[PDB]
């Protein structure tokens, strides 16, 4: 367990709750790790309370872990993520798109290269189409066609665009047989039932009851170093579940290896999440980096910059064979 894992998990729940409160009755999907990676990278070039709001916003605590080790945590994290088991497919990458003539701070450039395996690119944001073409392509290649046109409109004054992505392609340890997939009712709300292709398999599963969540937890094992956890809340206990999630509670689960006999019904699915995180990140405490008081002098000492837009998009596909997922971050900086 990576030293910085607990925090990443607490960021996930913190962020998830903001998102579920922003839109109450819609599908959600994002990549906590991806978002955390882009912003931890960003902080490197920030200072003062601009820098601290980001680290604290990511659920980090400087009294619990020294800053040097935090980045060092990400460094190993990205390294590990990019070293999956033969049977699993998983990649994550970081590209830093810097405008032409921008006088970067030597340290920042070297820090992002070493600690975040960031690739520096030079692009002219004045040639909007060209600028877009380059970013979306880098994203598309990283997400193997899963995430296209992450950027539809790019502002001409953009000074730099921090772009991050995660690609995932895992296979079920024990997959479903297509022939068992039949259409079933999905209960959306009191008066809304809908037919959806529902996969099913009879077998031994890791199924535990979490009273503290008033939910049942299902553990699906991927071939390799991946696992998916599904939470099925008791009647009327959805909000309670979202509210009660914590890292400790989860960690305790995976600690239980007891399997049981069951007939699992899991919905084949295809959901896409597209967000502007500027608002939800504000609720987390991250505001100054988006404001006229933002301090990005760590990235450049000539002009004062600021982040104007925090774009995140993630795509999830789940079927009989396993799961494919992609996540990508687009954080754009402009003169403050």
């Amino acid at each position: 367990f990576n030293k910085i894992t607990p925090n990443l998990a607490e960021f996930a729940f913190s962020l998830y709750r903001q998102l579920a409160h922003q839109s109450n009755s819609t599908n959600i999907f994002f990549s906590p790790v991806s978002i955390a990676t882009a912003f931890a990278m960003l902080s490197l070039g920030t200072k003062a309370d601009t820098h601290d709001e980001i680290l604290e916003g990511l659920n980090f605590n400087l009294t619990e872990i020294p800053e040097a080790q935090i980045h060092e945590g990400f460094q190993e994290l990205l390294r590990t993520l990019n070293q999956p088991d033969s049977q699993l497919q998983l990649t994550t990458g970081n590209g830093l798109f810097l405008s032409e003539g921008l006088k970067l701070v030597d340290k920042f450039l070297e820090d992002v290269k070493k600690l975040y395996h960031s690739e520096a690119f030079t692009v002219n944001f004045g040639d909007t189409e060209e600028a877009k073409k380059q970013i979306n392509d880098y994203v598309e290649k990283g997400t193997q066609g899963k995430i296209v046109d992450l950027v539809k409109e790019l502002d001409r004054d953009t000074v730099f665009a921090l772009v991050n992505y995660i690609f995932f392609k895992g296979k079920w340890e024990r997959p479903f047989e297509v022939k068992d997939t039949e259409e079933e009712d999905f209960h959306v709300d009191q008066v809304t039932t809908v037919k959806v292709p529902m996969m099913k398999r009879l077998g031994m599963f890791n199924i535990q009851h979490a009273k503290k969540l008033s939910s049942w937890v299902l553990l699906m094992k991927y071939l390799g170093n991946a696992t998916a956890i599904f939470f099925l809340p008791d009647e009327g206990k959805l909000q309670h579940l979202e509210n009660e999630l914590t890292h400790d509670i989860i960690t305790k689960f995976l600690e239980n290896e007891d399997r049981r006999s069951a007939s699992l019904h899991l919905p084949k699915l295809s959901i896409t999440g597209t967000y502007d995180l500027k608002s939800v990140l504000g609720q987390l405490g991250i505001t100054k980096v988006f404001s006229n008081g933002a301090d990005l002098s760590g990235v450049t000492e000539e002009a004062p910059l600021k982040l104007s837009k925090a774009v995140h998009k993630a795509v999830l596909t789940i079927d009989e064979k396993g799961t494919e997922a992609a996540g990508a971050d687009d954080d754009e900086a402009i003169p403050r």
Binding site: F1, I28, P32, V194, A226, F231, H265, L316, A325, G327
Partner: protein, 34 residues
């Protein structure tokens, strides 16, 4: 053998085995919705 059925809104997590980091998280409220 009991039927465990994800036919109502539910939450989930995709975890990396080694680091234990949350690669993905989502909520399904309605499959036919993306």
């Amino acid at each position: 053998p009991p039927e465990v059925k994800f036919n109502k809104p539910f939450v989930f997590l995709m975890i990396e085995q080694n680091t234990k980091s949350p690669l993905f998280m989502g909520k399904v409220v309605n499959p036919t919705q993306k």
